[PDB]
């Protein structure tokens, strides 16, 4: 029930936007990047992977993948609500330019919304499919 959010273009796995705060990231970051590579026009549009103490929750819309990591104990119900929120915002904001960019993180500035939206889900005072990530990878 913590953080790690990445938004990437499905086709090439091109990173579009992310957000992380520590005070490790290294491992789960690679796996996440692994997933993006693997994901394609045939992959499931909504999925939840099991990676031990952690649990990935992603959704795919308009050739873009919205990923999020967190402690398994975290509500899978909330995880996807969080992604949908991000999607609509992103799609509405950059949905049409997404397929033309070529630089990584061309939307780093989406950083802001991601984090303001993030707190609205990591604090009880505000209120598919499953597979062990290990497999896919």
């Amino acid at each position: 029930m913590v953080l790690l959010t990445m938004i990437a273009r499905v086709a090439d796995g091109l990173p579009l936007a992310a957000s992380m705060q520590e005070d490790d990231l290294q491992q789960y970051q690679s796996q996440a990047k692994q997933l993006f590579r693997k994901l394609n026009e045939q992959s499931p549009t909504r999925c939840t992977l099991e990676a031990g103490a952690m649990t990935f929750h992603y959704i795919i819309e308009q050739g873009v993948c919205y990923l999020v990591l967190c402690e398994a104990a975290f509500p899978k119900k909330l995880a996807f609500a969080y992604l949908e929120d991000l999607h609509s915002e992103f799609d509405e904001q950059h949905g049409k330019k997404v397929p033309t960019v070529s630089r990584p993180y061309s939307f780093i500035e989406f950083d802001t919304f991601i984090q303001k939206t993030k707190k609205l889900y990591i604090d009880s005072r505000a209120r598919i499919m499953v597979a062990n990530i290990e497999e896919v990878l």
Binding site: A73, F74, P75, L78, I122, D123, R125
Partner: peptide, 12 residues
């Protein structure tokens, strides 16, 4: 209120 967030299934 206490600025610190209270995680799921947790007490403050």
């Amino acid at each position: 209120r206490d600025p610190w967030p209270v995680p799921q299934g947790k007490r403050p």
